[PDB]
DNA sequence: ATCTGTACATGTACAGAT
DNA sequence: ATCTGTACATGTACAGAT
DNA sequence: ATCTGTACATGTACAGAT
DNA sequence: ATCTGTACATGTACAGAT
């Protein structure tokens, strides 16, 4: 009753939905067409959304939309960048309309990006229906931001993404743990999808920064958001409903009201909290423990597991286990003590930060 | 106790999958060849007990499909029968008469079996009301099989299927969507009627029948479904092995009764192995009431009632209740030869 | 005359709305 | 409960290119 | 367009632990 | 008797090379 309330403030509106669809889905196709045209480097790129808004777990508004604009590159071989897991340089065998972004067989993620971003600022100078700019470039985002005023303001993240399609790296070998969850025949399926490198494009000064590429699953993630139950009814019109999307949202909410107010918690994103439920969806694989009845202990036990991460400095990439979200290198422990203390007197005071 | 020890028996050997296998792979792989003729094209869907992974007592019996794309082709239905349809609009020469295909098909086979000079192979004769071409095998075993045509369209499923795989509780509407995306098929049965054929989708079934993801996975459960369906298929296998008054019974019968059962039970934990009698009991007393009202519905097409009087004869019908109430009440002696 | 990328046409799970 | 807009997967048509 | 290569599902088999 | 773990065998989806 006290966190239904939460989730019907969280809800959108058909009708922000419609309005903020209509332009953003017109905006999205010049761009995709404009890529295609002439001797365009992006000419072949394919559109996948991604994040929130098309796995039904937004909160608050429709007003920030991910979108995946993705290259296949084939015959491409990958060295790991000094054993991270995670980050990538793109290498070439053979000798291509990416060679003006080539350095010597390896492959530029800051000059392939930069070149992107050219095109699609280009792209919305033409755009005189509806009122839109293209945001300053953000250190570490593989983004490129449109700001959208619909009257109301919208974000874009037009993220620029190669796709290979052979198997997964061997830092993820030992990810994707859904065997005594979603089981291993979608775990098998899942790894014969594609994988996608973004731009770390980080500007932190260090070597080979800006030719640094990262994985990124966020179509996995997307399926398996939309796929989240041991049975496959769970949430559909004959099935049992569960409350995993809802504790998301309020976990993305708790972690959102509390960043708007400190600006300690710059270190912290979304992607946290959804990397910490993949593991409790693992942890507490059965559907009948997400009963939308037990909603705050569902709550409460997915907080006192973040609490733990936060405590032990420990937030293991879902897809890349070796890779550390929670590592001292990402964040300083004062910033997660200041996170598990605000987090634990939120927990135990009410939520007053709901109410907000 | 029992029915563990009567698996036992059931249960294929290692040593016999491999052989048979490697062997029918050589005919199936060389006919296919053959056909890419009017039937360049054709692709190769293994379909039934073996590949289902529910075939008993020996590696004997093998099905696949020769399907082929075939476009825009208009449908009729047949008097309202749900199952069978006339075919209209390379295959010029040929409405669509499902006789005349199959026998150049047929033509075909023949033809290129007769140049197999490494296997023991010759080509049944054929059986009316079989859509297939059958191959029999001597390995120093015998083994028959059956290669199915199949044309295969990839629009809307008709019409009659609408209210059909009535999959929605138990394997969930998402399930349901994507099977109806997949293609269907039609297949030969009056000279010029085919039949709609959902091997394929049986298939899928078979090995993803669990409400869980895991359900007989490494990391899940074990049900006990498929050995439901083995100890009926060997039930009624035996039992027509020695009446030849169930002649006009097939193991498909057994098979479109255990999906209602699926249906009708969907929880894993219905089918928990230490439950293999109850459950065992309970498809019976499914078959049972299936036959005393003379009512098993194609589980992909509703309306065509696989135990109606003009296909199966009320006295065929009472004569197997009889006989499975018999083996029923007695335990089943007929599983003990 | 055909071929074919682009995009209309069809159907339905999801979840907001009445 | 039922009605319903968006997203998305797949089937097909046809203008414009061959 | 056709085929090999790869990965891992579904099986069976058999011994050592329960 | 049942369960676990390893070995062994076939089927099947699809990347990619020819
Ligand atoms: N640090 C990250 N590491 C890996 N993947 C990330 C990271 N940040 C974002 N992503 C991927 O990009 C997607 C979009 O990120 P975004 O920051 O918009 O969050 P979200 O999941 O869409 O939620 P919301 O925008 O409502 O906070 C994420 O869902 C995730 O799949
Ligand atoms: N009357 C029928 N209607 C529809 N499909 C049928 C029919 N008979 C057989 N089939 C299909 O053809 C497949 C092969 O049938 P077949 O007679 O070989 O049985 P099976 O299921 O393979 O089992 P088994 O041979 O072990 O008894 C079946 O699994 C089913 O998909
Ligand atoms: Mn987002
Ligand atoms: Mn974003
Ligand atoms: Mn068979
Ligand atoms: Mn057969
Ligand atoms: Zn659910
Ligand atoms: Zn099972």
Redesign the interface.
Known sequence: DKLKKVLDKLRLKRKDISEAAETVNKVVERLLRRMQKRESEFKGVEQLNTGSYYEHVKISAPNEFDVMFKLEVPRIELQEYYETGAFYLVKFKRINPLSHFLEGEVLSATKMLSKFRKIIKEEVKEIKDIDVSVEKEKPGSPAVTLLIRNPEEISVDIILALESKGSWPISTKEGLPI????????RTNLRREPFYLVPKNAKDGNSFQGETWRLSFSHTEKYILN?H?????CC????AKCCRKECLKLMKYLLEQLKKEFQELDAFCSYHVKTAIFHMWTQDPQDSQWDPRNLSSCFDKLLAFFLECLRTEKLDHYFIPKFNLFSQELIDRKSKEFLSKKIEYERNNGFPIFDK
Do not use: H, P
Request: without cysteine; neutral net charge.
């Open positions: 065997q005594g969850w979603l089981g291993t025949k979608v796929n139950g041991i049975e496959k009814t559909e019109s004959s099935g």
